[PDB]
Design a protein around this ligand. Structure first.
Ligand code: HEM
Length: 465
């Protein structure tokens, strides 16, 4: 019962109930709870996830000392979350020294160089998306974005980690599409995870019963999948391509190296971390564009000016589109799908005047901060202008953090950005998007612990001649 803590330190917050902490307050989701506390406790506050104390911070400098300055020594890990199994060694779950080794070994995977080399691969599935989406534009019945984009997203993950070239959308069956599909990001407000937070003592029990938040079904398949390919597939050499797996294998053959269990776990996590995030953001971007016909027109003019007569998109060409970048960034402001960044304080400290005791989870409420009236004129509005070179000097890099910051930010950032824009450039060269009847306006965020549409986005899709 650390419920005494925040008053003992003099830190404001809502009143915990015995056992539950402040969880009952999650009935309206992480984001709405965060915005409420901000409005009423000011710069910093505390609360309890069961008996787990969590201190929220909104100070640009404070946030930076945590994410940047003192990542290495004090604020290195995220909070443990459930029985994790062999995935305990995935880079985004790993901790302290184990984590640093992996971050180092996997860094070259996401180089500028290696990114450029993957353009021809992912571009090839831009084509396929178009081909596909076209079919629906003829059908004239409203499109489901999460489905069209999920396909695209899966298509791109598979190929860029050993080239498993599959049209997911039309191959509803293939063993490989089915397993991966089931790799859905976790809802830390579902019945299961709510119980884990209140009875965290129940975790070691589950670990001993070989139960795991990553279903046995999918991970088994994948290890046994990666199995055949990793050796006895490319054990014949020739036509070596660029993909995360080879990239990781190449460091397997001459604090170095990756084990045959650690490599399987990164492979899985990349999917987990990339699959639904990419597809979701892309839905939010298409939503914004359809409910803002103007911005879409502006965007299609830029694309056409840079890439005349449907010319195929490229690396250098993509880094050159400033309005595209603006639209992507605005969308992320409004829908920063991680919602919060979190670090566990490993030892007593004081940071710009405020003392953090060992064991507290320090939490930065991204969704809140992105909508804070202090930094944003018209917070709730979709306005890409906000991110023009003529203004970007006015956005604070520790208020706007859709991919986090410091040494433990999204290692897949440049790749996510490039991949998404590629999808957009090709989709927008060919079609336009339009609100439907079944389109929700204004859209409504879920009650869950995911940032996602309450009801999946469906839009009218019109071809360009
Ligand atoms: C647009 C979709 C995506 C968004 C919004 C996104 C956002 C983030 C955020 C906010 C974090 C936490 C950073 C922190 O703790 O401060 C993160 C971590 C991470 N992301 Fe991304 N991400 C996206 C796609 C990706 C992709 C495509 C990959 C790689 C394939 C990726 C791999 C990771 C990994 C491995 C971590 C943990 C890094 C570490 O602990 O060293 N995510 N992501």
């Amino acid at each position: 019962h650390s419920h005494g803590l925040f008053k003992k330190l003099g830190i404001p917050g809502p009143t915990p109930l015995p056992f539950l902490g402040n969880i009952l307050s999650y009935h309206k989701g992480f984001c709405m709870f965060d915005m409420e506390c901000h409005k009423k406790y000011g710069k910093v506050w505390g609360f309890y996830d069961g008996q787990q104390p969590v201190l929220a911070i909104t100070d640009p400098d404070m946030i930076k000392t945590v994410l940047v300055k003192e990542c290495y020594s004090v604020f290195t890990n995220r909070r443990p979350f459930g029985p994790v199994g062999f995935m305990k060694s995935a880079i985004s779950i790993a901790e302290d020294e184990e984590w640093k080794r992996l971050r180092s070994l996997l860094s070259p995977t996401f180089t500028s160089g290696k990114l450029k080399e993957m353009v021809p691969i992912i571009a090839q599935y831009g084509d396929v998306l178009v081909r596909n989406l076209r079919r629906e534009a003829e059908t004239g019945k409203p499109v489901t974005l999460k489905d069209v984009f999920g396909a695209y997203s899966m298509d791109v993950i598979t190929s860029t980690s050993f080239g498993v070239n599959i049209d997911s959308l039309n191959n509803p069956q293939d063993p490989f599409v089915e397993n991966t599909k089931k790799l859905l990001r976790f809802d830390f407000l579902d019945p299961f995870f709510l119980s884990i937070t209140v009875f965290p003592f129940l975790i070691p029990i589950l670990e001993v019963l070989n139960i795991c938040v990553f279903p046995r079904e999918v991970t088994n398949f994948l290890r046994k999948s990666v199995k055949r390919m990793k050796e006895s597939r490319l054990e014949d050499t020739q036509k070596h391509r660029v993909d995360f797996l080879q990239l990781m294998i190449d460091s397997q053959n001459s604090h170095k190296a990756l084990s045959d269990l650690e490599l399987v776990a990164q492979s899985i996590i990349f999917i987990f971390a990339g699959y639904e995030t990419t597809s979701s953001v892309l839905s939010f971007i298409m939503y914004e564009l359809a409910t803002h016909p103007d911005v879409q027109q502006k965007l299609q003019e830029e694309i056409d000016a840079v890439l005349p007569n449907k010319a195929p998109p490229t690396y250098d060409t993509v880094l050159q589109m400033e309005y595209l970048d603006m639209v992507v960034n605005e969308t992320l402001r409004l829908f920063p799908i991680a919602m919060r960044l979190e670090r566990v304080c490993k030892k007593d400290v004081e940071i710009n005047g405020m003392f953090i005791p060992k064991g507290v989870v320090v939490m930065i409420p991204s969704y809140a901060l992105h909508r804070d009236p202090k930094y944003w004129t018209e917070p709730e509005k979709f306005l890409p202008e906000r991110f023009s070179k003529k203004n970007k000097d006015n956005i604070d890099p520790y208020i706007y953090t859709p991919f986090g910051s410091g040494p433990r930010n999204c290692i897949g950032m440049r790749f996510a950005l490039m991949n998404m824009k590629l999808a957009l450039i090709r989709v927008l060269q060919n079609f336009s998007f339009k609100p439907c009847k079944e389109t929700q306006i204004p859209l409504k965020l879920s009650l869950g612990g995911l940032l996602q549409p309450e009801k999946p986005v469906v839009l009218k899709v019109e071809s360009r001649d």
